[PDB]
Scaffold this active site. Structure first.
Site, PDB file in Angstrom:
ATOM      1  N   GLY A   1      60.486   4.885  65.536  1.00 20.54           N
ATOM      2  CA  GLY A   1      60.314   4.291  64.284  1.00 20.54           C
ATOM      3  C   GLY A   1      59.719   5.160  63.260  1.00 20.54           C
ATOM      4  O   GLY A   1      59.652   6.364  63.696  1.00 20.54           O
TER       5      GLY A   1
ATOM      6  N   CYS B   1      53.229   6.671  74.121  1.00 17.54           N
ATOM      7  CA  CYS B   1      54.069   6.526  74.956  1.00 17.54           C
ATOM      8  C   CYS B   1      54.280   7.767  76.048  1.00 17.54           C
ATOM      9  O   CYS B   1      54.731   7.570  77.062  1.00 17.54           O
ATOM     10  CB  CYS B   1      55.393   5.958  74.353  1.00 17.54           C
ATOM     11  SG  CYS B   1      56.128   7.589  73.100  1.00 17.54           S
TER      12      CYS B   1
ATOM     13  N   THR C   1      55.826   7.425  64.631  1.00 14.08           N
ATOM     14  CA  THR C   1      56.071   8.625  65.361  1.00 14.08           C
ATOM     15  C   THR C   1      56.844   9.437  64.444  1.00 14.08           C
ATOM     16  O   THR C   1      56.394  10.795  64.373  1.00 14.08           O
ATOM     17  CB  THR C   1      56.968   8.574  66.770  1.00 14.08           C
ATOM     18  OG1 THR C   1      56.463   7.603  67.474  1.00 14.08           O
ATOM     19  CG2 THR C   1      57.011   9.799  67.397  1.00 14.08           C
TER      20      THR C   1
END
Ligand SMILES: O=C([O-])C(=O)[O-]
Ligand SMILES: O=C([O-])C(=O)[O-]
Ligand SMILES: [Mn+2]
Ligand SMILES: [Mn+2]
Ligand code: NA
Lengths: 339, 296, 338, 296
Positions: free
Chosen positions: B158, B125, B161
């Site tokens: 969550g 991300c 990571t």
């Protein structure tokens, strides 16, 4: 040996005040002087721990690993500690520091985020490093909540969990309540430490409160050498601990000489309880933001005090110095627009 | 004719991806493949017309009408097992896990190079949000070093990571180099627990020559931001790119600093989960481009 | 209103750090800023009180009476306080300070010597002055002994008796026990105050311990402007008191601006927690000895730290700066003969 | 022969003066006059062969045998009432009280001026201790300002000094001026409660011209100390006179600084009570010079 183990962080937390400009000559002189005075643990790293050297936190003049290596070759009795933050440093950095002679690994997370450090404690213990955990910005949550996060670190292999007043915002009972909560939760599983800043002029007394509440490890820096208005001054911690019957194994006169003759000349100036620092302590602002706020203030022509107050309102935490730029521009935008 | 795609995985990512794919002009989700018969994800997919299963990827690979594309959001171990099976079956794969058996792709930077790849990876991300900016600078000047700082709401991080925070920093830093074009990369991630949860933001610092054409750099950054906006509408520039001269702080390097905010589409994930939203938005984009280039 | 009345002694205790070199301009600016920030009492005198200007303690650049007069004409809300020590200043000085607009007379004796102040409190009350009593070097005697002395002062007309940590040598409970002993012994007869130095880094905390033990008056100085490592910093006091629910009536941001923008430029340098100050705190040495010891150390080529350490061993008390020269010569002889 | 002297008062000063008079070659103590029939001073006197009384001074005025000289260590009140009676009876009086109905005398300085006086005053202990030093400087150079600091054991400071501390400082400063020869005087007294009790010491600061003959000054100071030592053996210089140049501290004044220590003989009072000792020793010296000159 001692009732409380003192860690000096003049060469890690003090790196913030030094703007990470330490030289080998400075580290060697300081390590030797502190070692000779009886300081059992000397922390050496970039202010933001392993991997801290960056645009965001400031580039190091000397790579931290070389400084750790030199510190370990200099110290005869003192152990070298180093800090690392998951999300900034890595396990590869911890192994490198270990290989360079570091023997105490201090892993720091924001006080609500201990679960990111679990693998780091595991690795550190497997490398035969002693472990310490930092729960940063500990004023932001209640004692019972902090104790649950400490339990996470403890279960992962952490040998001592610190209550860390990163913003210098805690007052006396606020430190005691947090320390006692951790002692009650950890019991025999881990020691409890305290590391405080001087932004409300309570560094030494907060450390005393921690000790009476059960803390067995305390951080300070000689001459307050550290972020914000500084860390608790070690030379004063020793003076006070001598008077209240807390054994450290550090000689007051020797450490005072070290602070004055060896540590002070390496400082760009004294650590000041000035308006900016006071604002941080009053607003709960992470101490290492100080010189970055002053820098952005110069860059954008806005007052550093304003940057710092707004950092508080934005609830920024450790590692978020980048947002000070965004705050500066927000001020410039509001000044133009008249909003 | 829309390319028929399968989704392997039935969690939050997969469900959010399902919603994006239903909106797609080029893609038609038809299968959701799981392993837990209890999965809420599989229930949702059924309601929307998809064929669902709990026998895993073997069930999918034994279907008469094979998918044109497969999106996988399971785990590195799971996708790494499935990947060889996709390739033998001749099904193009888009991997949203850290498996990285195939080239990592960032749409404005290197997607074109890999349109024929049988397996592509969506990196991180942080990578999807910041590497386009690094690329926008490096396509104009030499960038010896670039550094990205991601700030994400704690609740939108969550156990993935969280358990592998190092891998995020290392993998993202690697993408900054290889895909971003910086000679050296660094990545930092900060989890902030502020309530209400913060919208994800990212700061990108790129070292640049002291005589750099600043206007060209700024224009390039604006161009890449508009480009990212075609597939992530909530990706926004917070300020003009900021320029600085060599200093102690910067280690004698001139630099440009860019601030983005990434607001999620709120399809299934909340707007403050821009870190997850950008993964599924980017994946969808990559899928649509592959479908247009090699599949229509 | 307030729970605790803060007295700023930047312009009295700070005179020690300023080496008594205050000008009218500096006093005018500082008084004005502190008054505006809401500080209710501002102390203005030579560091050693009325009559302090001398070879022993240092000559004033500006006569203290002119400073009091200017401070009184400047302050619109704050009251002007002044210090006097029996054996240094006199009842005549007290009358002159009152005539010049001083409204709060603070009479200081060594903590075992309260009885020499009896007629001074009597005269002050007769002159319509509010009275404060300082028992200096309060770490030197047990809380019960200190309380006996406080009773002498209250019975003479003293309205508030301070525990005075002149050496910055008390630690927390040491302050609390002393304040408690005074509150219990004094009851309704007088308030209890605390005045602490920063020689062990405990100025603010000692002040908090005092308040929790019942102290209703607290001294500090903006920017620590005071003898030794300084007085408790007023701006930090206010921030801390704000957090723990103690009302002072002083705006934290306003007093922070004053300390930074007005008081600081008038200081020769920051007050430092340096080796000399730490030795003073650890050894129980009267804070005002600091710059005099440094002067003698330079005059006689001996280390100031050793000079100050020996001041503690000789059990010197407030006012005995002259003895620093004798100590310096003693050290010098030892050095001069290996 | 010896002059028959009377001591009026039976307190500490009186009883201590008794012993110095006993050792006198020119004076013979014969009467101690008191009011309290149980006084520890009267008992001591009578034990030493003196006539004693408790009727008071009126009794003493009625003895066929006239005292040649009377020492009074009572109080300012008492001496003022008694002073004219002594004068009327033709009895020379030495006053150790703060009465000061006659001129103040410091033996090395101005005693020679007042040998013919019917009534001499002994000023203060600080005065007796320090004014000789000020005189020693002022007889060599102009002294625009002189400052004395007396440090005294708390236990040595009785009710007189404590009730009248302002009067000590004012009277001593005035004497530093009128007798010492400084244009302006200042006195400071510090009561130190140290255990064991400190021996009294004094510091004398004299402003001098910047071109002053320092050798003449130091020589003069040593000469006066030796002179004082002839009647106070425990009186001594702690250091050589210290000379300093104009400074911020000194208000741009050059100066010489002198340090003395005054140890009592340990007669009726302990050696640390030098503040009381110097009164009696000096008083005895004055009496002896009066007896020599005007009497014998
Ligand atoms: O140094 C630190 O880690 C802090 O204060 O948070
Ligand atoms: O009154 C004072 O300044 C003292 O003794 O600390
Ligand atoms: Mn810190
Ligand atoms: Mn003071
Ligand atoms: Na820093």
């Amino acid at each position: 040996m001692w009732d409380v183990r003192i860690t000096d962080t003049s060469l890690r937390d003090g790196s913030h005040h030094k703007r990470h400009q330490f030289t080998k000559d400075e580290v060697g002189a300081i390590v030797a002087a502190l070692d000779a005075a009886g300081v059992p643990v000397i922390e050496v790293t970039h202010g933001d721990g392993l991997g801290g050297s960056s645009f965001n936190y400031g580039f190091s003049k000397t790579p931290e690993q070389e400084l750790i290596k030199l510190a370990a070759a200099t110290a005869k009795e003192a152990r070298i500690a180093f800090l690392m933050l998951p999300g900034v440093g890595t396990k590869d950095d911890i192994k490198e520091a270990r290989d360079n002679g570091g023997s105490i690994c201090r892993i720091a997370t924001h006080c609500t985020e201990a679960d990111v450090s679990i693998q780091h404690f595991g690795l550190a213990r497997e490398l035969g490093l002693e472990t310490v955990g930092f729960l940063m910005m500990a004023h932001t949550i209640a004692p019972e909540k902090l104790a649950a996060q400490a339990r996470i670190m403890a279960d992962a292999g952490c040998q001592c969990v610190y209550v860390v007043d990163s913003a210098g915002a805690l007052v006396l009972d606020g430190v005691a309540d947090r320390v006692s909560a951790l002692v009650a939760e950890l019991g025999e599983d881990a020691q409890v430490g305290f590391h405080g800043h001087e932004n409300l002029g309570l560094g030494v007394a907060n450390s005393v409160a921690a000790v009476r509440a059960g803390a067995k490890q305390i951080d300070g820096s000689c001459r307050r050498f550290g972020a914000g208005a500084g860390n608790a001054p070690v030379e004063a911690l020793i003076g006070v601990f001598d008077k209240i019957g807390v054994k450290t194994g550090i000689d007051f006169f020797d450490i005072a000489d070290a602070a004055e003759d060896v540590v002070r000349p390496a400082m760009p100036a004294e650590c000041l309880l000035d308006r900016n620092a006071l604002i941080m302590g009053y607003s709960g602002v992470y101490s290492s933001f100080l010189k970055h706020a002053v820098r952005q203030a110069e860059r954008y022509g806005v007052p550093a005090s304003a940057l710092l107050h707004r950092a508080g309102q934005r609830k920024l935490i450790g590692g978020q110095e980048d947002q000070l730029i965004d705050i500066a521009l927000e001020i410039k935008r509001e000044l133009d627009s008249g909003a | 004719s829309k390319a028929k795609v399968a989704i392997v995985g039935s969690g939050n990512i997969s469900t959010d991806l399902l919603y994006k794919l239903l909106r797609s002009e080029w893609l038609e989700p038809r299968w959701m493949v799981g392993i837990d018969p209890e999965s809420d994800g599989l229930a949702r997919a059924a309601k929307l017309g998809l064929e669902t299963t709990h026998e895993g990827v073997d069930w999918l690979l034994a279907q008469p009408d094979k998918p044109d594309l497969v999106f996988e959001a399971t785990s590195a171990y799971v996708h790494r097992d499935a990947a060889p099976k996709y390739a033998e079956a001749g099904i193009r794969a888009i991997d949203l896990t850290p498996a990285a058996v195939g080239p990592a792709v960032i749409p404005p930077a290197n997607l074109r190079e890999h349109l024929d790849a049988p397996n592509v990876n969506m990196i991180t991300c942080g990578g999807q949000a910041t590497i386009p900016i690094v690329y926008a600078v490096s396509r104009i000047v030499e960038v010896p070093y670039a550094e990205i700082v991601a700030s994400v709401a704690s609740v939108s991080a969550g156990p993935g990571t969280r358990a592998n925070i190092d891998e995020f920093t290392k993998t993202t830093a690697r993408g900054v180099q290889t895909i971003g074009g910086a000679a050296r990369g660094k990545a930092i991630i900060i989890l902030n627990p502020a309530d209400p949860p913060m919208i994800m933001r990212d700061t990108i610092f790129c070292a640049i020559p002291t005589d750099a054409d600043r206007e060209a750099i700024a224009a390039s950054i604006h161009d890449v931001v508009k480009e990212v906006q075609t597939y992530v509408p909530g990706y926004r520039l917070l300020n003009e790119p900021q320029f600085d001269e060599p200093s102690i702080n910067s280690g004698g390097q001139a630099l440009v600093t860019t601030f983005v905010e990434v607001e999620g589409a709120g399809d299934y994930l909340p707007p403050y989960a821009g870190n997850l939203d950008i993964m599924t938005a980017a994946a969808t984009k990559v899928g649509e481009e592959i479908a247009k280039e090699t599949l229509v």
